[PDB]
Design a protein around this ligand. Structure first.
Ligand SMILES: COC[C@H](NC(C)=O)C(=O)NCc1ccccc1
Ligand SMILES: [Hg+2]
Ligand SMILES: [Hg+2]
Ligand SMILES: [Zn+2]
Length: 256
């Protein structure tokens, strides 16, 4: 089954998921000199004050912080988006070393990690129908660099002990994702896909320019996580990132 290793990694995904060679695949390199400032972009609106987190799951490829999306609380609108997209989960992609980890790159620069807060277009009723639509999803991408600790990430850090192997989950209520946002909402945007199989080409990507700083000790604990399930030999959850894919004539816009 799909993973990030030699025998099942991103170079193999196309066999089960043909769309891997598709026309709007993600992530991509953000060539900052070719992206164009777009005057028609409305200001971004990230409203996470009412967010209702439920749990945290090791799914054998990343961990998911999942939210109650049965009502219009944590919502993303504005920017390149039409209408409202509700927050369903977030997860990270991260490296084995600080020089790699992010999925999107900026002028070929890799960050230590990347956070994706995943949202679905509420005109489609739920997530399931949302991923059958070219505008079904909006993902806010945020870079991580190793630096000063990020106070609003330590509560996820602290819980990782409890979900070390594939298929474990713990309760994770009252988590405030506002604690993960850099100061500036300047971003690049382009149409793309999810970066894990099934790689569905349903995503409006909104990639923040300003990275968050996280401490080495915080990112170390990410890398103590396991891809294997309990009582299987240890494979560290590291390098769970897909590399940049062909742009194929899509245009990246800057909000700034
Ligand atoms: C990770 O592939 C699934 C898909 N991924 C996204 C949205 O980033 C998703 O909607 N996941 C959320 C979810 C998971 C299990 C049950 C119900 C909802
Ligand atoms: Hg998985
Ligand atoms: Hg789609
Ligand atoms: Zn992701």
């Amino acid at each position: 089954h799909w993973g990030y290793g030699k025998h099942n990694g991103p170079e193999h995904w196309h066999k089960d998921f043909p769309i891997a060679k598709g026309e709007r695949q993600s992530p991509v390199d953000i060539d900052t000199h070719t992206a164009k400032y777009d005057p028609s972009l409305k200001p971004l609106s990230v409203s996470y004050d009412q967010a209702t987190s439920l749990r945290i799951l090791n799914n054998g490829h990343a961990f998911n912080v999942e939210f109650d999306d049965s009502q219009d609380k944590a919502v993303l609108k504005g920017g390149p988006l039409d209408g409202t997209y509700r927050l369903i989960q977030f997860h990270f992609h991260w490296g084995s070393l600080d020089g790699q980890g992010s999925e999107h790159t900026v002028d070929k620069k890799k960050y230590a990690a990347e956070l994706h807060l995943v949202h679905w277009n509420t005109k489609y009723g739920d997530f399931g129908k949302a991923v059958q639509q070219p505008d079904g999803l909006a993902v806010l991408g945020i870079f991580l660099k190793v630096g000063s600790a990020k106070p609003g990430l330590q509560k996820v850090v602290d819980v990782l002990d409890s979900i070390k192997t594939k298929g474990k989950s713990a309760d994770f209520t009252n988590f405030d994702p506002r604690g993960l946002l850099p100061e500036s909402l300047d971003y690049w945007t382009y149409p793309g896909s999810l970066t894990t199989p099934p790689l569905l080409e349903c995503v409006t990507w909104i990639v923040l320019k300003e990275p968050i700083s996280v401490s080495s000790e915080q990112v170390l604990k990410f890398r103590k996580l396991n891809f294997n399930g309990e009582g299987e030999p240890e494979e560290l959850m590291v390098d769970n990132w897909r590399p940049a894919q062909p742009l194929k004539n899509r245009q990246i816009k800057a909000s700034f």
